[PDB]
Amino acid sequence: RGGRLCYCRRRFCVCVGR
């Protein structure tokens, strides 16, 4: 798996990099 991630929280897909 990579570090970058994008999740749809309630009403928005948020892209982050952990």
Side-chain angles (χ1 to χ4, degrees):
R1 214 264 151 198
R4 296 304 324 272
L5 57 152
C6 226
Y7 28 90
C8 259
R9 276 190 193 186
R10 212 276 93 91
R11 199 233 83 170
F12 74 123
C13 258
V14 222
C15 256
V16 64
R18 212 233 65 161

